[model samples]
Target: MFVWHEYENAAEAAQSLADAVADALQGALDEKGGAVLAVSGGRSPIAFFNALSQKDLDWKNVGITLADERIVPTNHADSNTGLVREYLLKNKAAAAVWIPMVEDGKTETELHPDAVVDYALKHYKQPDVLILGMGNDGHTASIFPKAPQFQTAIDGSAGVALVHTTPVTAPHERISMTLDAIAHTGHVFLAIQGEEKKAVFDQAAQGENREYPISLVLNHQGVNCHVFYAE
Candidate 1:
């Protein structure tokens, strides 16, 4: 496993990713006039977002997007896009382009090619940085346990994947950035906070592949997984 760190608290961890992104953004702008970042929306990443937005970096030269998304309206309370808009997508940070994963009358799988995946790949190759948070159940992005594409999602897969939850949520199912996509990002951070989350991930790292989905990423080389914990 490529372990980046085990931070003392969320703040330090947050600051680190923010600093790294600022550097990458500056470098990218010097070359291509902007940078693209893929952010995971969740409580664990809140501290990271807060730290990231406060950076004195030039937001005009950055593109922001989510790692995975639910097929809900952008304003829904459970919507990660909403969470991001409320948190990271404000102030100078809001100036960056926002690429959402939903369309008026399309399911997530269909939207992947028609919208999210195609648009992202065309404009943004691999993200300058991909920051993600995991659930205690070991799910990252929207690659949840019992997900139909779990095997290929964890192991090896093609360019992009279109998967639907068999028992999908009420009006929609969760669609994710294929594990293959994540593996190719320039940089990846697994910013997990809280003692509870730490325990789950720690157990996952020790070789619990069946239930702890996060283990697959942790065990995979070339991907950096960083965890931040606090009581």
Candidate 2:
């Protein structure tokens, strides 16, 4: 089980989430001289992103990565990374590094997803903080029920830093941080909201693996996910 955060308003929730990110990055930067922070891109985190980017921290020493990305251009409406750029990537946060999963004209397969993941492992073994957002369907980190890379990406023991999803899930395919990678991070934040998602999280927590993809991550030892809900 994970910690829960409930707020009466979005403003209060944003500040709370920002404080958590700042606190976690503070510790990581102090110990390692730099911090690797992975964030999710979606409506749920847009508020949190706005708040987090303004926090006083060594933004330059903080490496930012998205939990997943659509195989679209950075400016594309469907691009997950594009969402993060608009919300948290302006101002001082511009100095933070971004690990992009897709190249301009390349698909995950064409880019050698293995090599892309290996690059991350070579650069950042364990992230200072990893934030994941769950869908109403119980998918997180792009590990969906329709993806072909499901089993390989969610292997708890693999500690895989890379994953490539199929186009079936969207107009374009994607690369994402595996569930194994999320489980081993120094801190994991699951930002989820709404009653529909609440039910999805509960379903995943109930050992319903065949249905909810989140169940695969929940089954791991010493792993917990923090959830935030307004309702």
Candidate 3:
């Protein structure tokens, strides 16, 4: 079910979203002594990440990873890991362990998909908190509707945790968590800003439409989806 949390502005929404995620992480740490967090990259999450980084939690017990990543080296401008390092892995959150999706010096076509999937399955726990960002095109976690692997990524029967995607509408090849993987997460937060994105999210929540890949996640019975929105 989609739980909506509306805010007056991006900064306000970021703080509330950070607080919600921190609470989930704290709960996981208390119950299991560890927590795993997966966050999406883009300009949208910068404020949220910064707020999360400053939270007074047991960050040393937390493991952080990307929900999806452009298949670029860590130093590249498009690297999600780089964005995380710069924005999220600071303050108290610096103590958290980072599990990167791509290694340095690797390009999209250079790395094998199976190897990436294997590595992800081995390192990522069922994320205690997953922060997702949606595109105007209605894609999430790089699971683009236009991508060749869209069906394979959204199919739960594939029994895969990760999939490699090459989106014709997007710039880089990406490695993203499969629908099964995202649906299985403990808490799913879809964070978005702007009226246009809100409109897109509203439409996606209405049905399981393949053209809007995000609809699959929103309508998935297995996912506990929460929407954090602002103008």
- Candidate maximizing lDDT: 3
What lDDT tens digits, residue by residue, belong to model 1 across residues 79-122?
78788888898766878887655544443345543354444344
Worst 10 residues of 1 by lDDT: 162-171
Off by over 4 Å in 3: 105-115
Off by over 4 Å in 1: 4-9, 30-32, 104-125, 161-172
Whole-model Cα lDDT per candidate? Answer: 0.69, 0.75, 0.89
lDDT of 3 by residue, 172-201 (tens): 778899999899899899999999998898
Candidate 3: the clashing residue pairs are: none
Pairwise TM-score winner, candidates 2 and 3: 3
Steric collisions counted per model = 0, 0, 0
Better of 1 and 2 by TM-score: 2
Q: For candidate 2, list the clashing residue pairs, or say none.
A: none
Question: What is the per-residue lDDT of model 2 for residues 110-140, given as tens digits with 9 covering 90 to 100?
Answer: 5555555554455544677988888777888
Query: Order of candidates by TM-score, top first?
Result: 3, 2, 1
Error of 3 at 189 (Å): 0.4
Q: Can you tell me which runs of candidate 2 are displaced by over 4 Å? A: 104-125, 156-158, 167-169
How does candidate 3 score on lDDT?
0.89
